[PDB]
C-alpha cells in the first residue's frame, strides 16, 4: 500500500479538471450550437459505449480505493503481484485521460474544426486509439497492467478451455454489466458498413426522421448474439467450474441464473420480429417474455443479495437482514445498497437487456441511454460487497483456504 | 520540508487543468467569436494586471520549489515560522484558482452569458473578489499566510516609519517589478469614473477608434505618480536603512538607483506633454529622457549582476564572471540568466517605465502588453539568485550573522 507519487496525483487532478471543463463545454455546445433537422441518435449510440467505459474505469478506481481503505485485500483475491499492483490513482488517471479523448472526439463531432476531415472520422479515431492503447506492445504506458488485462480478456473470451480464477469470473461479471458497450460496438460496425453514407459530409447524422435503417432494427438477429455473449461467457464458465469440481451446487444454480438471460433476449427478439411482422401471437410472445422476465430479475437479485454479497445471513444476530461480519465503517451502506440493488435490478433488464433488441417503446433509446450509467453504478456497488464477501468468508471456493 | 498532502496536489492539478482548458477556450473565442468595430484595448488594459498577478504567483511557486530543492533557506531569510510556511504547492494552487477566476471573468466579458448583467461588471467582480479574498477576516482560506502578507503590505506601503526586514525589502522589489499592476488599477479606476459609459450596454468596448478619452492620456499626470510609487517605496526604504545604520554604502547608491526611475518617468511625462501640445523643445526633452535612460538601465543592471546576485566576483577562480560559491546544480543557469537579465533589463524599461506614461508609439500598447510578462519573468529569475546570494553570503546585512 505504498503511496502514489505526487506527480501522478497532479496528473489525475489535471485530467479530471480538463474533463470537467470539456464536459461543461460539451453540454453548452449541445444545448446552444446545434440544428434540429437530423437525428442525433446515431452519435449518442456510438459514444455511449465510450462514456460507459470511462464511467466504469472511474468507478473501478473508486472501488479500488474503497477496497484498500476498508481492509478487503483485492490483491490477494485477484492473485496479483503486490509490487506492481495499480493504486486507485492510476485507474483514476487512465479514466481521466480516456475521458479527455472522448470529450475531444465528441466536441469535434459537434463542430468540425477541420472541414477537410469528415465528421464520422472522429468516432472511429477515438475507439481506434482506445484499442491501440490497450494493445500497445511497447512497454510505455501501464505495460504490466495492460498485458495482464490482455491475458485476462483472452482467458475470458475463451472461457471453457481455461481453468477459472477469481479474475476471470470477476471480469466476466463486469462484461455482463457492460453489455451496452458490446452492443454499441456492434451498432458502430453495422452503421459504418451499411448506413454511414461515406460520401455524405454529415452521413452519421441523417436527415430522415424515420429510422428505416436495419441497424437499429433486428432483422438479422445478430444483435441478440452480441447482447448475449456477456451472459453466455458466465454460463460457460459456471459449467466449466462444475465440470472441474463435480459439485452441482453452487454452479448449476449459477448457470441457470446466467442462462435466464438467454431466454430473456430470445423471447424479446421473437416479440420484436412477431410484432414488426404483424402476427397473431404477438401478445402471447409478449406475455411469455414478461413471464421469463421477473424470474430472471429475481434470480439475479436473490443471487446478489444472498451469495454474491453474503447478506440475509441467518447468524447475523445484531445486524438485521445482513451478515455477521462487516468490514465497511458504516452499517447504513449495506442497507442502502440492498435497496439500490433492488431498484436497479429491475431497471437494468428493462432498459438494456431488452428495449435494445426489440423496439417496443419510441423512448427506448432515451431509457437505455439514461439507465446504462445506473447499470454500471449497480455493478460498481456490487463490486464492493462481492469483494468484501470474498475477503471475509470464501465464496465460490476460488481460494484453497 | 514536510511533503504536501495528496489532496492539495490533486487540487493544484485540477486548477491547472481547468486553467489550461479555459485559456484554450479563451484564445479560440478571441480569434473566432469577436466583432472588429470596437477597441478591445480597454479590456486588455483592465485584465493585464490580473494576468500579471496570476503569472507572478505561479512563478513565485516555481521560485519556492527552486529554493527548497536548491538548498537556499527562504524560511530563515524571510523570518517565517517553519511550521506554517507555504510550500510551492499552495502557491501553485492559489495561482491556479485565481487564474480560473480570471479566465471565467474574461470569458464572461467576451460573450455575456446573462443579458441582464452588464459586461463591465465582470472585471469589477473579479478584482473585488480578489481584494475580498485578500482581506478575508474569517480564518478559512490560507489565513496565516494571508494575514502575514497583509502585515507585509501594510509595512511596505508605510515604509519610512517601520524598521525594514528582508520581507519588506523583497516585497518592495516585487512591487517595483509589478508596477504594471498598479498602473492598470489606476487605469481601471479612471476608466470607470469617466469613460466607462455606464448607460451603454457595451461601454467598455467603445466604437470610436480615436482614443480621445484622457484615461489613456496623461493630462493630469497622476499616472506618473502611480507608476513611480513602486520605486518611491524602495527609495524611501533605502533612505530609512541608511538613517538606521548611518552607512553611506551600500544604501545611498541603492537610493540613487531607485531614484533614477523618478527622473526617467519625469522626463517621459514631460516629453508627452511637450509633444502633445506642440512646443519647440520636444526634441530636447526626448534627448534628456533618453540620456537619463541608459543610465537608469545600466545602474539597475550592474546592481543586479554585482550586489543582488553577487556575480562577477573577483575570487570566483574556476568560475568565469560568476561567484566563488554556487548552489544551483547547473552552472549554465547563471550564464544564461546574465544574458536574460541584460536583455530584459533594457526591455522592461523601454516597455513599461515609459510608453505607458507617454504616447510615443501607436504600438505602445502591444509592446507593453507583450513585455510586462517578461518583466515578471525577469523578476522571477532575479528572485532565484538574490535569495541564493542572501543564503550564501549576507547581502544588505539584514541578518545579524
Ligand atoms: C456539468 C457537467 C458535468 C461535470 C462533471 C464531469 C465529471 C466529474 C468528474 C469529477 C472527478 C472525479 C474523480 C476525482 C477524484 C480524485 C481523488 C484523488 O485522487 O484524491 C486523492 C486522495 C488522497 O489520497 P489518500 O487517501 O491520502 O491516500 C492515497 C494513497 N496513495 O485519494 C483518494 O482518491 C481518496 C479520496 C477520494 C476517494 C474517491 C472519491 C472521489 C470521487 C467522488 C465523487 C466524484 C463525482 C461523482 C459524481 C458527481 C455528481 C453527483
Ligand atoms: C491539451 C489538453 C486539453 C485540451 C483542451 C481543448 C480545448 C477545446 C475547447 C473547445 C471550446 C470551443 C469554443 C468555441 C468558441 C466559439 C466558436 C464558435 O462559435 O465557432 C466555432 C467555430 C466555427 O467557426 P465559423 O462558423 O467559421 O465562425 C463563426 C463566426 N462567429 O469552429 C471552429 O472552427 C473551432 C471550434 C473549436 C474546436 C474545438 C475542438 C477541437 C477538436 C480537435 C480534434 C479532436 C479529435 C481528436 C480525436 C482523438 C481520439 C483519441
Ligand atoms: C471489445 C469490447 C470490450 C468491452 C470492455 C472490455 C474492457 C473492460 C474494462 C477493462 C478492465 C478494467 C480493469 C480490470 C482489473 C481491475 C482490478 C484491479 O485493480 O486490477 C489491478 C491490475 C494490476 O495490474 P498489475 O499488478 O500490473 O498486473 C500484475 C503484474 N505482473 O491493473 C488493472 O486494473 C489493469 C487495467 C488495465 C488498464 C485499464 C484498461 C485500459 C483501457 C481499456 C480500453 C478498452 C477499449 C475498448 C474499445 C471499445 C469500446 C466500445
Ligand atoms: C494555449 C493557451 C495557453 C496554454 C497554457 C496555459 C497556462 C499553462 C500552465 C500550466 C501549469 C503549470 C503549473 C503546474 C505544475 C505543478 C507541478 C506539481 O505540483 O508537481 C508536483 C511535483 C512533485 O513534488 P516533489 O518534487 O515530489 O516534492 C514536493 C514536495 N511536497 O512538485 C513540483 O512542483 C516539482 C516539479 C515541478 C516544479 C515546477 C515546474 C512546473 C512549471 C513548469 C513550466 C510550466 C509551463 C510554463 C510555460 C509553458 C510554455 C512555454
Ligand atoms: C466549475 C469549474 C470549471 C468551470 C468551467 C467553465 C466552463 C466554461 C466553458 C465556456 C465554453 C463556451 C462554449 C460555447 C459553445 C458555442 C456557443 C455559442 O456559439 O454561443 C454562445 C452563446 C450565445 O448564444 P446565442 O447567440 O443565443 O446562440 C447562437 C446560436 N448558435 O453564449 C451564451 O449565452 C453562453 C456562453 C457560454 C458562457 C461561458 C462563460 C460563463 C461565465 C459565467 C459568469 C462568469 C463571471 C464570474 C466572475 C467571477 C469573479 C471572481
Ligand atoms: C493594490 C495593488 C497590489 C499589487 C500587488 C500586491 C500583491 C503582490 C503579490 C502578493 C505577494 C506574494 C507572496 C509574497 C511572499 C512569498 C514568499 C513566501 O514563500 O512566503 C511564504 C508565506 C508564509 O506564510 P506563513 O508561514 O503562513 O506566515 C507566517 C505564519 N505565522 O506565504 C505567502 O507566500 C503568503 C502569500 C499570501 C497569499 C497570496 C496572495 C493572495 C492573492 C493576492 C491578490 C491581490 C489582489 C490585487 C487586486 C488588484 C489587481 C489589479
Ligand atoms: C439509494 C441508491 C440509489 C444510492 C445509494 C448508494 C450509494 C450512494 C452507496 C452504496 C454503497 C456505498 C459505498 C459503500 C462502501 C464504500 C467504501 C468506504 O470506504 C467509503 C464509502 C463507500 C465508497 C460507499 C459510497 C456510497 C455508496 C456507493
Ligand atoms: C474495435 C474498434 C477498432 C472499432 C471498430 C472499427 C473497425 C473494426 C470497423 C468500423 C468500420 C469498418 C469498415 C466499414 C465499411 C467497410 C466496407 C466493406 O466493404 C469492407 C469492410 C469495411 C472497410 C469495414 C472494416 C472494419 C471497420 C473499419
Ligand atoms: C427463467 C428460468 C425459469 C429458466 C430456467 C433456468 C433454471 C430455472 C434452471 C436451469 C438449470 C436448472 C438446474 C439444473 C440442475 C440442478 C442440480 C440440482 O442438484 C439442483 C437443481 C439444479 C441446480 C437446477 C435448478 C433449476 C435450474 C437452475
Ligand atoms: C445455446 C444456449 C446455451 C444459448 C443461446 C443464446 C443465443 C445463441 C440465442 C439467444 C437468443 C437467440 C435469438 C432470438 C431471436 C432470433 C430472431 C429470429 O428471427 C431468428 C433467431 C434469433 C436470431 C435467435 C438466435 C439464437 C439466439 C441469439
Ligand atoms: C424467481 C423464482 C420464481 C425462480 C428462481 C428462484 C429460486 C428457484 C432460487 C434462485 C436463487 C436461489 C437461492 C440461491 C442461494 C441460496 C443460499 C442457500 O444457503 C439457501 C438457498 C438459497 C437462498 C437459494 C434458494 C432458491 C433460490 C431463491
Ligand atoms: C535566454 C533567456 C531569455 C531564457 C533563459 C532563462 C531561464 C529559462 C532560466 C534562467 C534561470 C533558470 C532557473 C535557475 C534555477 C532553477 C532552480 C533549479 O532547482 C531548477 C531549475 C531552475 C528553476 C531554472 C529554470 C530555468 C531558468 C528560469
Ligand atoms: C481595488 C479594487 C476593489 C478595484 C477598484 C474598484 C473600485 C474601488 C472603483 C472602481 C469603479 C469606481 C466607481 C466608478 C464611478 C463612480 C461614480 C462617482 O461619482 C463616485 C465614485 C464611483 C462610485 C466609483 C467608486 C470606486 C469604484 C467602485
Ligand atoms: C540617472 C542618474 C544620473 C540620476 C542621479 C542619481 C545618482 C547618480 C546619484 C543620486 C545620489 C548619489 C549618491 C549620494 C551620496 C553618495 C555617498 C558617497 O559616499 C558615495 C556616492 C553617493 C552614493 C552618491 C552616488 C551618486 C548618486 C547615487
Ligand atoms: C520627490 C522625489 C524623491 C520623487 C519624485 C517622484 C514624483 C513625485 C514625480 C516624478 C515624475 C513627476 C511628474 C512628471 C511630469 C508631470 C506632468 C506635468 O505636466 C506636471 C507635473 C508632473 C505630474 C510630475 C509630478 C511629480 C512626479 C510624479
Ligand atoms: C550608468 C553609469 C554611467 C552611471 C551609474 C553607474 C555607476 C556610477 C555605479 C552604479 C552601480 C555601481 C557599482 C555598485 C556596486 C559595486 C560593488 C563594489 O564592490 C565595487 C563597486 C561597484 C561595482 C559599483 C561601481 C560603480 C557603479 C557601476
Ligand atoms: C447517472 C445518469 C447519467 C445520465 C447521462 C445522460 C446522458 C444522455 C441523456 C439524455 C439523452 C437525450 C437526448 C436528447 C435527444 C433527443 C432526440 C430528439 C431529437 C431528434 O429526433 O433529432
Ligand atoms: C511571455 C509573453 C506572453 C505574451 C502574452 C500575450 C498577450 C496579448 C498579446 C497581444 C495583444 C494583441 C491584441 C490584438 C489587438 C489589436 C488591436 C487592433 C484592433 C482594434 O483596434 O479594434
Determine whether the interchain pair A4/B6 forms a contact, defined as Cβ–Cβ distance below 8 Å. Answer: yes
Alpha-carbon span B328 to B299, nearest angstrom: 26
Contacts of A35 (CB under 8 A, 6+ apart): none
CA angle A59, A65, A66 (to 5 degrees): 85
In terms of Cβ atoms closer than 10 Å to its own Cβ (0-12, 13-18, 19+), residue A188 is: buried
Name every chain A residue with its beta carbon within 8 A of the beta carbon of B103: none
Ligand 16: residue of B304, B306, B393 to mutate (most ligand atoms within 8 A of CB) is B306
Report helix, strand or coil for A277.
coil
Helix A166-177 / helix A179-190 crossing angle, nearest 10 deg: 60
Determine whether the interchain pair B15/A17 forms a contact, defined as Cβ–Cβ distance below 8 Å. Answer: yes
Query: Most A CBs within 10 Å: which of B1, B6, B16, B17, as the mutation test of the A interface?
Result: B17
Q: Is the CB of residue B88 below 6 angstroms from any atom belonging to ligand 4?
A: yes
Residue B345 annotated in ligand binding: yes
Contacts 24+ apart (CB under 8 A), B208-216: B208/B39, B209/B39, B211/B39, B211/B41, B215/B187, B215/B190, B215/B191, B216/B41, B216/B45, B216/B187, B216/B359
Report helix, strand or coil for B66.
helix
Q: Does B10 touch chain A (CB under 8 A)?
A: yes
Q: Which ligand is nearest to the CA of B121?
A: 5
Q: Is the CB of residue A343 below 6 angstroms from any atom belonging to ligand 5?
A: no
Determine whether the interchain pair A18/B13 forms a contact, defined as Cβ–Cβ distance below 8 Å. Answer: no
Contacts of B21 (CB under 8 A, 6+ apart): A17, A18, A21, A22, A25
Q: Does A190 touch chain B (CB under 8 A)?
A: no
- For CA atoms A340, A343, A346, A352, the dihedral sign is negative
Contacts of A22 (CB under 8 A, 6+ apart): A100, A103, A104, A107, B21
Q: Which ligand is nearest to the CA of B50?
A: 6
* Grid coordinates belonging to A5: 507519487
The structure was resolved to a resolution in Å of: 3.3
Residue in this structure with the C-alpha cell 520540508, named with its chain if needed: B1
Alpha helical stretches, state H, A37-120: 41-70, 74-78, 88-110
Alpha-carbon span B106 to B99, nearest angstrom: 10
Alpha-carbon span B150 to B131, nearest angstrom: 11
* Grid coordinates belonging to A88: 486507485
Residue B258 annotated in ligand binding: yes
> How would you classify residue B228: left for phi > 0, otherwise alpha for psi between -120 and 50, otherwise beta?
alpha
Q: Which ligand is nearest to the CA of B345?
A: 12
Q: Which atom of ligand 6 is nearest to the CA of B184?
A: 51
Candidate from B13, B16, B20 with C-beta closest to A12? B13
B contact residues 11-70, partner A, Cβ 8 Å cutoff:
11-18, 20-22, 25
Nearest CA to A28 out of B340, B111, B41 is that of B111
Alpha-carbon span B351 to B227, nearest angstrom: 13
Alpha-carbon span B341 to A156, nearest angstrom: 63
Report helix, strand or coil for A161.
helix
Name every chain A residue with its beta carbon within 8 A of the beta carbon of B14: 13-14, 16-17, 20
Residue B209 DSSP label: S
Cβ-contact B49, B180 below 8 angstroms: yes
A–B CB contacts, 8 A cutoff, strictly below: 59
Q: Is the CB of residue B85 below 6 angstroms from any atom belonging to ligand 15?
A: no
Cβ-count burial A289-322 (b if 16+ within 10 Å, e if not): beebbeebbebbbebbbebbbbbebeebeebeeb
Distance A261 CA to ligand 10 centre (A): 11
Candidate from A13, A20, A25 with C-beta closest to B12? A13
Neighbours of B329 (CB within 10 A): 9
Ligand 13 contacts (CB < 6 A) are B 127-128, 131, 189, 192-193
Ligand 14: residue of B256, B268, B302, B353 to mutate (most ligand atoms within 8 A of CB) is B256
Residue B277 annotated in ligand binding: no
Residue in this structure with the C-alpha cell 412477431, named with its chain if needed: A274
By CA distance, what is A93's nearest residue in B?
B10
Residue A258 annotated in ligand binding: yes
Residue B379 annotated in ligand binding: yes
Contacts of A382 (CB under 8 A, 6+ apart): A177, A304, A308, A309, A341
Is the bond leading into B66 cis (omega within 30 degrees of zero)?
A: no
Determine whether the interchain pair A12/B16 forms a contact, defined as Cβ–Cβ distance below 8 Å. Answer: no
DSSP secondary structure string for all residues of A212-262: -STTSS-SS-HHHHHHHHHHHHHHHHHHHHHHHH--HHHHHHHHHHHHHHH
By CA distance, what is B17's nearest residue in A?
A14
DSSP secondary structure string for all residues of B146-204: HHHHHHHHHHHTTGGGS---HHHHHHHHHHHHTHHHHHHHHHHHHIIIIIS-TTSTTTT
Report helix, strand or coil for A179.
helix
| Alpha carbon A73 to chain centroid, angstroms | 23
Name every chain B residue with its beta carbon within 8 A of the beta carbon of A22: 21
CA dihedral A63, A65, A69, A72 (to 10 degrees): 40
Ligand 9 contacts (CB < 6 A) are A 248, 252-253, 256, 259-260, 263, 292, 295-296
Alpha-carbon span A208 to A316, nearest angstrom: 59
Q: Whose CA is nearest to atom 24 of ligand 13?
A: B193
Q: Does A267 touch chain B (CB under 8 A)?
A: no
Candidate from A4, A9, A22 with C-beta closest to B13? A9
Determine whether the interchain pair A18/B18 forms a contact, defined as Cβ–Cβ distance below 8 Å. Answer: yes
* Grid coordinates belonging to A85: 499492483
Q: How many residues are present in chain B?
A: 401
CA angle A159, A155, A186 (to 5 degrees): 80
Amino acid at each position: 500500500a505504498q503511496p502514489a507519487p505526487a506527480w501522478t496525483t497532479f496528473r489525475v487532478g489535471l485530467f479530471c479538471g480538463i474533463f470537467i471543463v470539456l464536459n461543461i463545454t460539451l453540454v453548452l455546445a449541445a444545448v446552444f450550437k446545434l440544428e434540429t433537422d437530423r437525428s442525433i441518435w446515431p452519435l449518442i449510440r456510438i459514444y455511449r459505449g465510450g462514456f460507459l467505459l470511462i464511467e466504469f474505469l472511474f468507478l473501478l478506481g473508486i472501488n479500488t480505493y474503497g477496497w484498500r481503505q476498508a481492509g478487503v485485500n483485492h490483491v490477494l483475491i485477484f492473485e496479483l503481484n503486490p509490487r506492481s499492483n495499480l493504486s486507485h490513482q492510476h485507474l483514476f488517471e487512465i479514466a481521466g485521460f480516456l475521458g479527455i479523448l472522448w470529450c475531444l472526439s465528441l466536441l469535434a463531432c459537434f463542430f468540425a474544426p477541420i472541414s477537410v476531415i469528415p465528421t464520422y472520422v472522429y468516432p472511429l479515431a477515438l475507439y481506434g486509439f482506445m484499442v491501440f492503447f490497450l494493445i500497445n506492445p511497447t512497454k510505455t504506458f501501464y505495460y504490466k497492467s495492460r498485458f495482464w488485462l490482455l491475458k485476462l480478456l483472452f482467458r475470458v473470451f475463451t472461457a471453457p478451455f481455461h481453468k477459472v480464477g477469481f479474475a476471470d469470473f470477476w471480469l466476466a461479471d463486469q462484461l455482463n454489466s457492460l453489455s451496452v458497450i458490446l452492443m454499441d460496438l456492434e451498432y458502430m460496425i453495422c452503421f459504418y458498413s451499411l448506413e454511414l453514407k461515406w460520401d455524405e459530409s454529415k452521413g452519421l447524422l441523417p436527415n430522415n426522421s424515420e429510422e428505416s435503417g436495419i441497424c437499429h432494427k433486428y432483422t438479422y438477429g445478430v444483435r441478440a448474439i452480441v447482447q448475449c455473449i456477456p451472459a453466455w461467457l458466465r454460463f460457460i464458465q459456471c459449467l466449466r467450474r462444475y465440470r472441474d469440481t463435480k459439485r452441482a451446487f453452487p454452479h448449476l444454480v449459477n448457470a441457470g441464473k446466467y442462462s435466464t438471460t438467454f431466454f430473456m433476449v430470445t423471447f424479446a427478439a421473437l416479440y420484436s420480429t412477431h410484432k414488426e411482422r404483424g402476427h397473431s401471437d404477438t401478445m402471447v410472445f409478449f406475455y411469455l417474455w414478461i413471464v421469463f422476465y421477473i424470474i430472471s430479475s429475481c434470480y439475479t437479485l436473490i443471487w446478489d443479495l444472498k451469495m454474491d454479497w453474503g447478506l440475509f445471513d441467518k447468524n447475523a444476530g445484531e445486524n438485521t437482514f445482513l451478515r455477521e461480519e462487516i468490514v465497511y465503517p458504516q452499517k447504513a451502506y449495506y442497507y442502502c445498497a440492498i435497496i439500490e440493488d433492488v431498484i436497479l435490478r429491475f431497471a437494468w433488464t428493462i432498459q438494456i437487456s431488452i428495449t435494445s433488441t426489440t423496439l417496443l417503446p419510441h423512448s427506448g433509446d432515451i431509457i437505455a441511454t439514461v439507465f446504462a450509467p445506473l447499470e454500471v453504478f449497480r455493478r460498481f456497488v456490487w463490486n464492493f460487497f462481492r469483494l468484501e464477501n470474498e475477503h471475509l468468508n470464501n465464496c465460490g471456493e476460488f481460494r484453497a483456504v
